[PDB]
């Protein structure tokens, strides 16, 4: 009962990224009983929708949905108008109004484009939040890639001291391709997920959303550098290990001497040992 969903997850990570949505369709063809629950487990590329009253696009998600009815972050509405409760926490309303503004100013300084969205929750002790960012490739530019990232934020209660523990989980999907004539076609893909927790004070000069912006920006910079240097870095090592650029008869001529050198040095180091 529990091994099959683990096997489905194992299949999911194995396939290449660039067509996974087709595989999601194929997934619901195989096993219908576990179709719903796997969507809560496997991250998926997100969909783009259009607001009709303000003329701008927003980002569909899973946790801003109730009975197959979504809410826009900017203009409170639903596809069925006024059939269910919409956008609680009026005291948090203003903390969305700045936030929907705030992170797009962060879009303008890093991505020079893209689409963002934020939706906060209510819970028993504090609140929670889900933050989405998407960037598509440029039509004019030869490079055609995609960046998606999802973030989940939780805050616990504190009786006194004005110190809040933010727990931030993040996940990133990345796709790149090049078609230069010198090297033909090359493709690169990536999926990563991380977490951390941090305590920090609450101040009038530094409200909560300043801290949330700090954590989001720090996580994105760290994950970008980590994926560029550590993960993508040693693919170059594998491909240069498949074949050396220069001919190498020379090292094989002295390789047995190198092995004997290692053996006698291993003898000698124990022989003296300082």
């Amino acid at each position: 009962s529990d091994q099959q969903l683990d096997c489905a997850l194992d299949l999911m990570r194995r396939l290449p990224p660039q067509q996974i949505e087709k595989n999601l369709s194929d997934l619901i063809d195989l096993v219908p009983s576990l179709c719903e629950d796997l969507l809560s487990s496997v991250d998926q590329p997100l969909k783009i929708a259009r607001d009709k009253v303000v003329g701008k696009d927003y980002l569909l998600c899973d946790y801003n949905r109730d009975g197959d009815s979504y809410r826009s972050p900017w203009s409170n509405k639903y596809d069925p108008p006024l059939e269910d409760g919409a956008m609680p926490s009026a005291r948090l309303r203003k903390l969305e109004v700045e936030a929907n503004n705030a992170f797009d100013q962060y879009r303008d300084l890093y991505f020079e484009g893209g689409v963002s969205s934020v939706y906060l929750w209510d819970l028993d002790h504090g609140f929670a939040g889900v933050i989405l960012i998407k960037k598509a490739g440029d039509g004019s530019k030869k490079i055609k890639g995609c960046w998606d990232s999802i973030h989940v934020v939780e805050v616990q209660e504190k009786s006194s001291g004005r110190t809040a523990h933010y727990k931030l989980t993040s996940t990133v999907m990345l796709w790149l391709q090049t078609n230069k004539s010198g090297s033909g076609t090359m493709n690169l893909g990536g999926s990563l997920t991380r977490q951390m927790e941090k305590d920090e004070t609450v101040s009038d000069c530094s409200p909560h959303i300043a801290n949330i912006g700090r954590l989001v920006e720090d996580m994105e910079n760290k994950i970008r550098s980590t994926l560029n240097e550590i993960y993508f870095g040693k693919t170059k090592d594998i491909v240069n290990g498949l074949r050396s650029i220069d001919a190498i008869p020379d090292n094989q001529k002295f390789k047995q001497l190198q092995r004997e050198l290692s053996q006698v040095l291993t003898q000698r180091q124990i022989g003296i040992q300082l």
Binding site: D29, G137, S191, N228, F232, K234, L242
Partner: protein
């Protein structure tokens, strides 16, 4: 859920199988499917095609050599063909069974050409690779003889959590008026240490040089191949080293123009109008 839909879905799943490991995906596609009797024959062609495309090696029963399987070079029926030693073999697509100790008969029309091709390709397949295997086939297509030279290298390691494979194929024609050289290259590497990273790359090349006699014919295509491969590695390394400032800045910048963390306090919280008259008058 229609059965033949499921069969072909498993077929294109295994067709795009991950880089190299076959047992785990085979076990799990067995797990999802109920009718293994239909799996025996309705997935035989898919597994066979996966063996054909990957250029896997097989170690024969103790003649001190291993041979590849080529889509354009194998015999095509249930029993395949070898370049050397004149012994056709039957290779199982799943169990790697060895059988069929029955020789065959070569055409013999241009055996010097294929033997020289083997001898020359062998020399610059050993030293210039760390670990790789090659094969060479000769066949008459459309009344013209063609020599196919195929190369494959693998560095499988499960415990370290990465896989890699190089495959390449080259075509050579017999035209004393003018020769022609066709080449195809592909690289596949996979890294999954607490993440996913895929890299697939493909290349195709068309080129040619003057004709020559048997004393010299074993050298021109070798030099063309070595030049093409070396320029290809130069190109991919040169393109990869400038990733963070040429191709990856379109998706996301490392730091902004200011070369500092964005100051969120001032973001949360007219001089430019007045300064325009000064800018006009001074400049």
């Amino acid at each position: 859920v229609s059965d033949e839909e499921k069969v072909r879905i498993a077929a294109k799943f295994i067709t795009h199988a991950p880089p190299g490991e076959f047992n785990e995906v085979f076990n799990d596609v067995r797990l999802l499917l109920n009718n293994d009797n239909l799996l025996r024959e309705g997935a035989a062609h898919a597994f066979a095609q996966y063996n054909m495309d990957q250029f896997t090696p097989v170690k024969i029963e103790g003649y001190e050599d291993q041979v590849l399987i080529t889509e354009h070079g194998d015999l095509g029926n249930s029993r395949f063909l070898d370049p050397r030693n004149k012994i056709s073999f039957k290779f199982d697509h799943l169990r790697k069974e060895a059988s069929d100790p029955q020789p065959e008969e070569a055409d013999g029309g241009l055996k010097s050409w294929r033997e020289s091709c083997d001898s020359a390709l062998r020399a610059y397949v050993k030293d210039h690779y760390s670990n790789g295997f090659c094969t060479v086939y000769a066949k008459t297509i459309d009344g013209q003889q063609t020599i196919i030279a195929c190369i494959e290298s693998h560095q499988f390691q499960p415990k370290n959590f990465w896989n890699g494979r190089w495959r390449s194929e080259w075509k050579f024609t017999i035209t004393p008026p003018t020769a022609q050289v066709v080449g195809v290259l592909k690289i596949q590497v996979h890294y999954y240490e607490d993440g996913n990273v895929q890299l697939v790359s493909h290349k195709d090349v068309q080129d040619s040089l003057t004709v020559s006699n048997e004393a010299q014919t074993a050298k021109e295509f070798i030099k063309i191949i070595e030049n093409a491969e070396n320029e290809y590695q130069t190109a991919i390394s040169e393109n990869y080293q400038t990733m963070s400032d040429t191709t990856f800045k379109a998706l996301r910048r490392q730091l902004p123009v200011t070369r500092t963390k964005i100051d969120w306090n001032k973001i949360l919280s007219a001089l430019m109008e007045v300064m325009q008259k000064r800018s006009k008058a001074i400049h």
